[PDB]
């Protein structure tokens, strides 16, 4: 931290939130700031570094980025009310539940005629080590180290290859971009003022299995970004490979280094940006619902089935789980499955020209 | 600082300088990095913070930024050798000399047909406050306050007002930049890898007299950037107005807050980027030299007359190469003298005449 800072009145350090449209600006008052300005985490992460994201960008919705797990407890006065509003009422007294049991997932195969692709993405961080806003070079290398080794120990259908973003050649860069596996130069301001673009690309890397349905990004926003994806609508299979890979990797790391995933009872998995807390899961499917798009209640139909839609490229929508924190991976995934099946059924009624007032919420 | 960093062996924290072309990758050895990785300045600035600019950008030539004044001494092991190669053999034993004497400036008026505008700028930092890569908001506002007030005390032709970058709209700002008065908005990799773009635009602004031949940038790369500029080639006059506002702005700050500019005997004025030590002066003109641009000797000839050229119509910015080890009067005079030869050569080439005998030897 800057040691001259504390000789000054907090008042003089308090951000001007004029024009800002973030939850940071809405909940951090002058008195709350005067209270935590000189209070840092055990690893040395400050309040300023924590809010740098939003002070620098007034239109970012949250404008908050944690540098370690203790950031959520040391700066609870700011994080809790922000987590509560974003996560639709999740309180500081509420506790998150994890349920990564693949056998609990519905075996309903969504209509291949309406569903193009199925996807499951989550993020994981390593316990006891600084997140990206704050991570040093040695910690980052060590993460890359224990994670790539665990991915490289994967076998059978999880068997694959690791790629260091460092000194990568154009041939390999072109390949990964053609597959949509590659992530590069963190030029975006979310990363730059977030302190996450440091030392790039030292410590960064990507990994994908030979069958190309299991993808892992290394040391981007979170220590690991895990994605499982394939064509069609067999979400259940997508989630079962997703869960198997996660289990085998944590187990390799846990036994070879002694460490596991950043995780606690109140928040579930700890992620850098609080918008991905709890499950950090994004279960999505590309569905073809053109007649739904013209229907006005499409938005509300989804919100009540706890889902969000996103247009993508005619009439193709990305339908994902609305919840992250407060409900489980199992519930969020079966939420998408049941929801999409209901969406396909209403879609067929509109194709025929029938009414679906018999299916929508009251 | 990351308190968990000292727990790891220094080698695992040591930068992979593979492919870097900077002075940082050339002088920061593994053993040096090991000895200075956990040594922080009195204000808390770290070695990592200081070298971030070059670690992130291997194309950069220097790679290091100072967080405060103690940075230059606490990390002298890195900065001295770097300062020495960059500033042509300037050792830590050598000492910088100041000379802001306006009466000693060459009174030649550069041909206005070729010299569009003349400019003189320098950087000043207030002692006791962190520099831009480390400065917090309260310090930045305090600086913004003590400088803007020192400037509104100026009278007559130096008389002007302060414009906060928070108060001015995008169109006034784009205008000021296209017209060469206001600084670029900090989105270059240099500003973002060094921690200098934090809280922007809180604490920054541009102050200028109603005339606009005298202005100063507040809290960009350096606490202040004092500028003197006008149309034409009367450099001695640009410099005169420059040393006046400079003197007066410094008297006011002292009288009102008792603060002064960072300056020691070895380095002269202390600036954030070590490329700007000594005088912190960039004496420049925007000259019309389309015939010189076609000559492959252009660069060699500039370098010879100790000048740097950076283009964009054959329009070039011609400034002094040297900063540290020689004075303000010497640098400005070096530019007046050199741009003069450049103008003469240009008049030859226009006539299809020789300039071979004009080439410095
Ligand atoms: N002789 C000149 N006449 C008019 N404008 C100039 C002159 N020299 C530089 N400028 C303008 O000043 C602005 C800043 O120039 P820049 O290249 O940043 O030089 P500087 O102010 O010394 N900063 P730096 O980039 O650190 O060297 C630009 O918009 C230029 O158009
Ligand atoms: N103030 C400046 N931009 N000086 C020029 C060199 C800066 C550049 N970031 C480097 O370290 O190479």
Curated annotation (Swiss-Prot), chain A:
ATP binds at residues 117-121, 180, 225, 282-286, 310-313. The keyword Glycosyltransferase does not apply. Pfam families: ATP-gua_Ptrans (PF00217), ATP-gua_PtransN (PF02807). Disulfide bonds: none annotated. It catalyses: L-arginine + ATP = N(omega)-phospho-L-arginine + ADP + H(+). Its EC number is 2.7.3.3. CDD domains: creatine_kinase_like. GO terms for molecular function: arginine kinase activity; ATP binding; creatine kinase activity. GO terms for cellular component: extracellular space. Keywords: ATP-binding, Kinase, Nucleotide-binding, Transferase. Residues 114-350 form the Phosphagen kinase C-terminal domain. PROSITE patterns: PHOSPHAGEN_KINASE, PHOSPHAGEN_KINASE_C, PHOSPHAGEN_KINASE_N. Gene3D superfamilies: ATP:guanido phosphotransferase, N-terminal domain, Glutamine synthetase/guanido kinase, catalytic domain. The N-terminus is blocked. Residues 5-88 form the Phosphagen kinase N-terminal domain. InterPro entries: ATP-guanido_PTrfase (IPR000749), ATP-guanido_PTrfase_AS (IPR022415), ATP-guanido_PTrfase_cat (IPR022414), ATP-guanido_PTrfase_N (IPR022413), ATP-guanido_PTrfase_N_sf (IPR036802), Gln_synth/guanido_kin_cat_dom (IPR014746). GO terms for biological process: phosphocreatine biosynthetic process. Substrate binds at residues 221, 273. The keyword DNA repair does not apply. Homodimer. PANTHER family: ARGININE OR CREATINE KINASE, CREATINE KINASE M-TYPE. Belongs to the ATP:guanido phosphotransferase family. This is Arginine kinase. It comes from Stichopus japonicus. The gene is AK.
